[PDB]
């Protein structure tokens, strides 16, 4: 129950939590809760589950929470509107891509292995192997949502395309965006074409 609830308390409900932060005080957010880069996170761990759930597990979990916050930030920020028509077309060009990316990170990873993992932890017979299957869940979800290494070819690309989402949000000059976007998009596909191979799921899009 704790394990399922933990990843429901970060990684719906938290969308409302982030929309308040979209528009300081850390105690304000708690009260708003109870009824893009950086943030602090905190939640108490009780002792009988603290002998299985690690403190460093919260860190790994927190990193992908920050990434997801950037994703929802991009989704909501380009969702601020519904010749000068020219901006519309730059809307569809960008708002699609971050959506498609959001479809891949979320469902294909955080729901596939996530739905599998509960069925795995209900089959453990011991306290010890329960830790091992848990850490061997953590280390692979930390690789699928890539944060370890080769991150100088992928995560900088995701950051630099998110800077376009900053630029368009201010912009609501224009010509200098597509020149960058087609280029870094081609970087993404030309690297991710043969380069673990699950990255092909966005190389065809």
């Amino acid at each position: 129950e704790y394990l399922q609830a933990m990843r429901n308390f970060f990684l719906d409900t938290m969308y409302d939590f982030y929309t308040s932060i979209f528009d300081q005080n850390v105690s304000f957010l708690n009260v708003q809760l109870q009824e893009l880069d950086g943030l602090t996170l905190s939640y108490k761990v009780p002792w009988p589950v603290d002998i299985v759930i690690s403190l460093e597990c919260q860190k790994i979990y927190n990193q992908v929470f920050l990434l997801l916050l950037q994703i929802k930030w991009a989704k909501y920020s380009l969702d601020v509107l519904l010749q000068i028509h020219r901006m519309f077309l730059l809307r569809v060009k960008l708002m699609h891509f971050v959506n498609s990316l959001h479809n891949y990170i979320m469902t294909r990873i955080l729901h596939s292995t996530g739905l599998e993992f509960q069925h795995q932890v209900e089959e453990a017979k011991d306290l010890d192997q329960l830790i091992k299957i848990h850490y061997r869940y953590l280390s692979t979800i930390h690789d699928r949502c890539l944060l370890r290494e080769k991150v100088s070819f992928v995560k900088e690309a995701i950051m630099k395309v998110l800077n376009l989402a900053l630029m368009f949000a201010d912009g609501w000059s224009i010509e200098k965006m597509e020149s960058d976007f087609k280029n870094c998009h081609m970087f993404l596909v030309t690297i991710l074409n043969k380069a673990f191979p699950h990255l092909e799921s966005l190389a065809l899009s």
């Binding site: 719906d12 969702d79 519904l82 028509h85 077309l89 569809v92 959506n99 479809n103 979320m106 799921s201």
Partner: protein, 420 residues
């Protein structure tokens, strides 16, 4: 957020009653308002949380010269809603003028309900185009709602009057209503009478009692359209996030809907995707091409199969649309509801922007122009007369719908950098 429903027109009040009855059956609600004994799921958008957890439907019924409202009155489901939200000629201008003089108290009722709600997201409209009394008054209320609330959303569910003829003045009324719908509404859900009638005559063997079945059809469609909000997942649990993908441009805001089982009372998702792309599962009628397609699935789904299905259907190229740009299909998932027996539990919905409805509009543009040219079909109605002695509002709407058809046909072209 929190959405208030408005219902007007005879068929609109029919489908509103059926929709609320369907949601009371769907959720753990008794027809008295009481929570069921066996009731996790959200009812905090369309149902006020009252004193005995009474999920009182957030609905405002608007009517004039009531007939079917009396049949609503003597019902066990007349205790689910009506906390006194009920307030008591077939011309557009008649209903416009009548709504004009009583705009204040009904707007007061709207403000009362807005005060009663803690948050607000949208006013969803149950409408019947050229339904007589619903026409004109519905356009008037739509204009008033857009005026008073520039921060809220307007969704319109309506049927388009085509029964292959009847009324010689209804294309004028529907044209004025369409002019109002284009300018004073944010997103429009379009329905066709003859198409749903043909499907009803198809899967069943009825010819007259089509209303009683079409109520079920629209109720199922509308509830399916809201299921991911009513049954919380985490993809697009807001209206605005869902609507943002569906509208590619503020000039094209009409949405085509389907329903994967024509009758559902164990196929895989791959099959019913192929079924849904067949037009016999589509319930709304050069090349006509979609701009953007979305689908929503609710059933017993394996999460790997949807990926490989998207692969195979992508490679098969059963998506007969050619866009002008980068827009593609979008997938979504929802929960199968409890307490309802469903054989072949996989059920899907589609929301797509398709240009073909322009031709349907063109049919009316042809008809109205024909009756304008012969000029024996305006019939000299008096409400139409003092409202507009020169009848240039019809010319204004003709101008707008011509611009609309041209925008449609410019969107058909592989560039939209040129306009129409």
């Amino acid at each position: 957020r929190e959405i208030i429903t408005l219902q007007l027109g005879q068929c609109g009040n029919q489908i509103g009653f059926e929709f609320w009855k369907q949601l009371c059956a769907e959720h753990g609600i008794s027809p008295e308002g009481i929570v069921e004994e066996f009731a996790t799921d959200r009812k905090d958008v369309f149902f006020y949380q009252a004193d005995d957890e009474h999920y009182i439907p957030r609905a405002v019924l608007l009517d004039l010269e009531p007939r079917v409202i009396h049949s609503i009155l003597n019902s066990p489901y007349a205790k689910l809603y009506n906390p006194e939200n009920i307030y008591l000629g077939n011309n557009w201008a008649s209903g416009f003028s009548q709504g004009e003089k009583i705009h204040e108290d009904i707007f007061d009722i709207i403000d009362r309900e807005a005060d009663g709600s803690d948050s607000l997201e949208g006013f969803v409209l149950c409408h019947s185009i050229a339904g007589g009394t619903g026409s004109g008054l519905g356009s008037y209320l739509l204009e008033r709602l857009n005026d008073r609330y520039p921060k809220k959303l307007v969704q319109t569910y309506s049927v388009f009057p085509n029964q292959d003829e009847d009324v010689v003045v209804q294309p004028y009324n529907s044209l004025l209503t369409l002019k109002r719908l284009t300018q004073n509404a944010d997103c429009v859900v379009v329905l066709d009478n003859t198409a749903l009638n043909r499907i009803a005559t198809d899967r069943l063997h009825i010819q007259n009692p089509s209303f009683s079945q079409i109520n079920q059809l629209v109720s199922t469609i509308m509830s399916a359209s809201t299921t991911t909000l009513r049954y919380p997942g985490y993809m697009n649990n807001d209206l605005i996030g869902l609507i943002a993908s569906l509208i590619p441009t503020p000039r094209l805001h009409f949405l085509m809907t389907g329903y994967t089982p024509l009758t559902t009372d164990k196929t895989t998702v791959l099959d019913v995707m192929r079924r849904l792309l067949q037009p016999k599962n589509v319930m709304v009628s050069t090349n006509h091409c979609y701009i953007a397609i979305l689908n929503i699935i609710q059933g017993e789904v394996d999460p790997t199969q949807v990926h490989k299905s998207l692969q195979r259907i992508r490679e098969r190229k059963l998506a007969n649309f050619i866009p002008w740009g980068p827009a593609s299909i979008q997938v979504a998932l929802s929960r199968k509801s409890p307490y309802l027996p469903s054989a072949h539990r996989v059920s899907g919905l589609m929301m797509a922007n398709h240009t073909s409805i322009s031709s349907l509009f063109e049919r009316t543009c042809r008809q109205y122009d024909k009756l304008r040219k012969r000029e024996a079909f305006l019939e000299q109605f008096r409400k139409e007369d003092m409202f507009k002695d020169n009848f240039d509002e019809m010319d204004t709407s003709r101008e707008i719908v011509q611009q609309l058809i041209d925008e449609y046909h410019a969107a058909t072209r592989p560039d939209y950098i040129s306009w129409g």
